[PDB]
Amino acid sequence: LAGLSAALLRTDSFVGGRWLPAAATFPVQDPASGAALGMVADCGVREARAAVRAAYEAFCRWREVSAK
Amino acid sequence: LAGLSAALLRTDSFVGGRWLPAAATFPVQDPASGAALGMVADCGVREARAAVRAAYEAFCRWREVSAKERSSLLRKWYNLMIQNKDDLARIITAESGKPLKEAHGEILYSAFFLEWFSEEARRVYGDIIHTPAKDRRALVLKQPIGVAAVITPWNFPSAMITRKVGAALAAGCTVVVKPAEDTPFSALALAELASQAGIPSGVYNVIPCSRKNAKEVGEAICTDPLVSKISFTGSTTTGKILLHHAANSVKRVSMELGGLAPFIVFDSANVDQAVAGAMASKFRNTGQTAVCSNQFLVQRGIHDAFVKAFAEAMKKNLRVGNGFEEGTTQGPLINEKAVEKVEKQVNDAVSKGATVVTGGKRHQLGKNFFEPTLLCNVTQDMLCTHEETFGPLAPVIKFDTEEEAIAIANAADVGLAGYFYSQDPAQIWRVAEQLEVGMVGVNEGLISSVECPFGGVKQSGLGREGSKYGIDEYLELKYVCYGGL
Amino acid sequence: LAGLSAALLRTDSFVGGRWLPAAATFPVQDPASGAALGMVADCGVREARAAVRAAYEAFCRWREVSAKERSSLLRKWYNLMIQNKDDLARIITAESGKPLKEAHGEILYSAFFLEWFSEEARRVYGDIIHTPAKDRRALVLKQPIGVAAVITPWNFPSAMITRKVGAALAAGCTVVVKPAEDTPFSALALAELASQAGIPSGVYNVIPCSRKNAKEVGEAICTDPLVSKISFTGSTTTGKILLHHAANSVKRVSMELGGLAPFIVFDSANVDQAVAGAMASKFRNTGQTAVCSNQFLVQRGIHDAFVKAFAEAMKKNLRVGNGFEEGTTQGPLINEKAVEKVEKQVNDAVSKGATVVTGGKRHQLGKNFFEPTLLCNVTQDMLCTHEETFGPLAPVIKFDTEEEAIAIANAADVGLAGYFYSQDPAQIWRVAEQLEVGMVGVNEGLISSVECPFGGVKQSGLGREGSKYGIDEYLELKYVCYGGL
Amino acid sequence: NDAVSKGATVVTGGKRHQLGKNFFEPTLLCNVTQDMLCTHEETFGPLAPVIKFDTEEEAIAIANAADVGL
């Protein structure tokens, strides 16, 4: 169940290199035991448009990075 | 980022002297780095009606407290602000994005309003009037209105609250503050300090809420029959909606609405001074303020010399970047919608005649940063629908005569702040008096002051804040005809 | 009836210095005898927009006239009113129906407002404020708002106009008056005198109109972008409609809305004096005024002695009849709808517990006359929907304690005038300060005075008229930061 | 209020309590009448309306009034 590297188990969205929580959250449960696994950010259109802009700006620089 | 007195950074609403969380919350992020700052309570109509009742009950007791006592508490609150100025400033930079130095400037200004009204509390004077009749004496008392709904913008997350609440409490009223969702923290930091100062429970209430609940809560507190006064600073569109809400119960209202501020430079002006003045009046808070000179009317003679010296000052002093980092002079724009409006204005102007003199695209840091822009050859007709578009943008419109400049400046049915530079004694009076604006700066680009009356004329607002007139917005006159003599 | 200076009795609207008839007209009749008084112009939206433009253009010149000059004209106008007081009084009695003696009292009061503001014109002072910065000086100027839409009721067809227009002109503003359709004449008589005085064309405009056009014209002038201020006195229902019209363009507003006035008689009161005070405060203008004490809260101890002495005073001094005839003390009710509301109130109260002490039916002269009524054993709940029912009716509600009387009086979310009689020095202050009203009479039933501030709190109004605060409703503050020093 | 303004006589505490918030003063009104309980069949609070009666048959008739019975 636990014992995991706390950094691997995450509940916030990951946008622009940062962990951003959302106004809402949704529960996640172990489909076998029904146990609560955690409260994950429930992104909305706003968080999505912002994640897109973040990706678009990263693209203009990432496309320039050498393939190697 | 952190290191703050945990008590200053708050996430719950502050009602009835207690920190109450809400059923929902909304995220707050650093406009520069995009970092998560915290999850703030998202109050709804229920929490608002409850905050109002809390304020109304506190009012029936607070109105009874001696003015010397209310004055004392207003001062302790001021001292607490000064004691925590560094942390209070960091919170402003964190949520508004403005550079630390500017945030420190706001925290002082904000603290000065509490100090100032503290002094006004003991000076509410009634009058004794003489009337013909010998069988009576006329007395005029001044009493507090009651509960006031205070709605503030994000530009000055602290000073905008403090200048209204200071007056309200000094007058003997209580308040329910609904802070901007982009910057709720500064409003709650104040709340913490208000409980440390000993402000009685229910006298100062804060109900943060996001866009969703903004509509509902706004109408809830501007409609509630226990609320007798409304103080709002923001857009004209919201202002008119609140004015309708108020209309239904004849509530006293005072508000400041975002307008266009003309900055006229006449031939007889000291160039460097005009430029220095233009620099401060346009880039303070990255051009994001209602009193930020949007259009520059410059006279033919001195035009060129000015436009050149202005641009040279922009390159030399404006350093775009993160507000917490040393040397930053321009912070980010509050959000994406904002950047889009600046772009809109710049393009609309260039494609219509304007000539970009320096930086007219997004800044190379991306996100919400925009390059300080200066376009010349701009024309009047290029400002339509951008009367509420704030950003580090400076359109220069050339003019020939004074009559022309005044005519152009008084154009809009707007009228908040206005600036002009000149060395002609006579001209200074003519313009200062003819400029249909609420505030006029003469050979100065920064006119802030807690002892002077801030506000606007025509559609820019109602009433005034600060100065010796500020407390008036919260009092009611009672004529007492003492007869039977 | 006639014999008046033909120039004083007018039927056309007065716009731009000229008498202009309208496409339509409406009849005006003597509320007592039903006689035809004249056919008055019925202005429509077109005539109103034109009257506004006329006022706006006059404003751009009038604002420039020296205060000593505007003051002089305001005084000549006053002298003209006094010179014609007898005829001006007859016109009031002719259209309002109030007794001549009362009409003479109004004409003086009305003339006194012009006299008073005449004196205020030269006393609009700006300030010089001290600020930390040594490179600047703070000046605060006061300037007129612009064009003001003035809407008046029929109760005081002259004084209600004069107290608003006096202030407006003294401040340097121009006005467009829309008088009540029941009493338009007094407003035009003033106009004639304003042209005799030499008031510049367009400074004072009158646009009479009937019920039909009332809605349209009302919204036309409270909406017009050339109008910057609205002054209204009347019903709460209309007031809220105008408040919405104003909301759309953020217009400055001041208004007085018909409320219930409590008249508390305490045990320590001088009976005769209380009665004398109750007589004047309830039957002046046959109980048809917003400041007319509707409910009488009388304390157990002195109750009976009071109710009896009151009734005995009503029989001895109230003589119903035609206002022009010697000895008349009670005139007619403005119209049928009015009589029906009084009947409504009387019946609703008797059939619910009340006990009619004297005259509770229509008067034997018929038409719009009603018998002076005095019901005792009345209870709070019997005043619902009659908060705007004016007539020679006096419901007496008994009470035990002071806390009770104050609680009952402050009941409504209303608050215009309030009266009470007592001989206890301490009690006089407690009540006078706790009575949530705009004006309080202490051991006096008549508190009119042009040098004192008239108005109300909560839903009874906004702003004040008369006194040294009256002119403030028409000025705008301008903070001038004189820097570069 | 509905009761006092309709005949009832407040014998003790009939306003909100001086602590404010949700506290109410224990109230006892006498001279109350049957018709003053309409729509308040589900109004709970420290309130006690006293209705006088003459005979037993009367009391039972009044009590069994409502189509209620807990």
From Swiss-Prot, chain A:
Subunit structure: Homotetramer.
Domain of life from the UniProt record: Eukaryota
Name used for this protein in its record: Succinate-semialdehyde dehydrogenase, mitochondrial
Gene name of the record: ALDH5A1
Family affiliation: Belongs to the aldehyde dehydrogenase family.
UniProt disease annotation: Succinic semialdehyde dehydrogenase deficiency: A rare inborn error of 4-aminobutyric acid (GABA) metabolism, which leads to accumulation of 4-hydroxybutyric acid in physiologic fluids of patients. The disease is clinically characterized by developmental delay, hypotonia, intellectual disability, ataxia, seizures, hyperkinetic behavior, aggression, and sleep disturbances.
Function description: Catalyzes one step in the degradation of the inhibitory neurotransmitter gamma-aminobutyric acid (GABA).
Compartment list: Mitochondrion
Tissue expr: Brain, pancreas, heart, liver, skeletal muscle and kidney. Lower in placenta.
Source taxonomy: Eukaryota, Metazoa, Chordata, Craniata, Vertebrata
